[PDB]
Amino acid sequence: GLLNCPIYWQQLREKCLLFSHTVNPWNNSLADCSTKESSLLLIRDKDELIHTQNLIRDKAILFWIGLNFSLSEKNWKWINGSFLNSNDLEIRGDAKENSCISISQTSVYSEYCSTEIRWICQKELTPV
Amino acid sequence: LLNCPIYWQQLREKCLLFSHTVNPWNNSLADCSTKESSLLLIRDKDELIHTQNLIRDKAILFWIGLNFSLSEKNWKWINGSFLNSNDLEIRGDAKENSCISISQTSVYSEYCSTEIRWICQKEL
Ligand SMILES: *[C@@H]1O[C@H](CO)[C@@H](O)[C@H](O)[C@H]1NC(C)=O
Ligand SMILES: *[C@@H]1O[C@H](CO)[C@@H](O)[C@H](O)[C@H]1NC(C)=O
Ligand SMILES: *[C@@H]1O[C@H](CO)[C@@H](O)[C@H](O)[C@H]1NC(C)=O
Ligand SMILES: *[C@@H]1O[C@H](CO)[C@@H](O)[C@H](O)[C@H]1NC(C)=O
């Protein structure tokens, strides 16, 4: 209505973001975003990573993003079907079966996909 | 001027997109999420019937937003709720690695790896 993003979402440049208040494994986080007619967070570059991190106050909290390990292809792939195409995220940890990517205020971590953490959904105001 | 994005079909209070390509169920969910949309949710027999009327080819199956949860041993929607109903009259087995699809006439359990078309929705 009034603002570009709906109630409870936060605008950050060309995206509306929803930071969850509950926890889920990665696959349930994806389901949640879909239910809310949104995507798990896709991070275009380092600059976007840093601006998103600058919204987070609590330095200890992890959030799933829309990237996980494809075992058959042995690399990180976004839910839009693309391979990770740069090192802008400086992922910390192992690239192995049943791993998924999370972010905190300061870092980006590989975590087992069964781990129960918060998640970030996006709606694009100006898609590519 | 109409209620839905270009290529989406209005049905009652939803906009639906019927894929033309195929995918296993997990990729289908990822596709809908990428399109800022949900895999199809069906509330009851009347919404099933009306959606099925949009499918004009008898062979073709379409994934919806319903699969078999292994931990819970029951059918669960992607919105978190259990099916907890027999309205859809599911044909086939309720077992690990099974997902739900729809045809023009029926509702089928299929292996989640099966590559078929899928239906995404946006609520009006
Ligand atoms: C998928 O998202 C990633 C991260 O934003 C981006 O690098 C990539 O180009 C996108 N792929 C497509 C097909 O849009
Ligand atoms: C990785 O994400 C893709 C969707 O892009 C999906 O095919 C699969 O469920 C995910 N794998 C795991 C182990 O979470
Ligand atoms: C999940 O969607 C299904 C099918 O439309 C419906 O039965 C159920 O009420 C939904 N759950 C919630 C909380 O809306
Ligand atoms: C079933 O869907 C749920 C999301 O609601 C997800 O936890 C899981 O990835 C799916 N399982 C299979 C085998 O596709």
Residue numbers in the entry:
A (entry chain B): 90 to 217
B (entry chain A): 91 to 214
What are the paper's exact sentences on this?
Signaling by the human C-type lectin-like receptor, natural killer (NK) cell inhibitory receptor NKR-P1, has a critical role in many immune-related diseases and cancer. Human NKR-P1 and LLT1 are type II transmembrane glycoproteins with similar protein topology: an N-terminal cytoplasmic signaling tail, a transmembrane helix, a flexible stalk region, and a C-terminal C-type lectin-like domain (CTLD). In addition, NKR-P1 promotes transendothelial migration to immunologically privileged niches upon interaction with its endogenous ligand, lectin-like transcript 1 (LLT1). Here we report the crystal structures of the NKR-P1 and NKR-P1:LLT1 complexes, which provides evidence that NKR-P1 forms homodimers in an unexpected arrangement to enable LLT1 binding in two modes, bridging two LLT1 molecules.
The asymmetric unit of NKR-P1_glyco contains two monomers, whereas the asymmetric unit of NKR-P1_deglyco contains eight NKR-P1 monomers. All these monomers are arranged into very similar homodimers, with pairwise RMSD on Cα atoms up to 0.5 Å. The dimerization interface of the NKR-P1 homodimer consists of six protein–protein and several water-mediated hydrogen bonds, a peptide bond interaction via delocalized electrons (Lys126-Glu127), and a small hydrophobic core comprising Leu119, Ala120, and Ile168 from both chains. Glycosylation at Asn169 is visible in the electron density maps of both NKR-P1_glyco and _deglyco structures. In NKR-P1_deglyco, a single GlcNAc unit remaining at Asn169 can be well-identified in all eight NKR-P1 chains. Interestingly, the localized first GlcNAc units linked at Asn116 in NKR-P1_glyco and the overlapping GlcNAc units at Asn116 and Asn157 remaining in NKR-P1_deglyco participate in dimerization contacts with residues of helices α1 and regions β2, L1, and β2’ of the opposite subunit of the NKR-P1 homodimer. In NKR-P1_deglyco, density at the homodimer interface can accommodate the remaining GlcNAc unit of either Asn116 of one chain or Asn157 of the opposing chain of the NKR-P1 dimer (for details). Conversely, in NKR-P1_glyco, the first GlcNAc unit at Asn116 is well defined in electron density in both chains, A and B, of the NKR-P1 dimer, while no electron density was found for glycosylation at Asn157. This suggests that although the glycosylation on either Asn116 or Asn157 can contribute to the dimer formation, dimerization might be impaired by steric hindrance if both N-glycans are present simultaneously. However, the structure of the NKR-P1 homodimer shows that Ile168 is found at the dimerization interface rather than at the membrane-distal interaction interface – more specifically, in a small hydrophobic pocket within the dimerization interface.
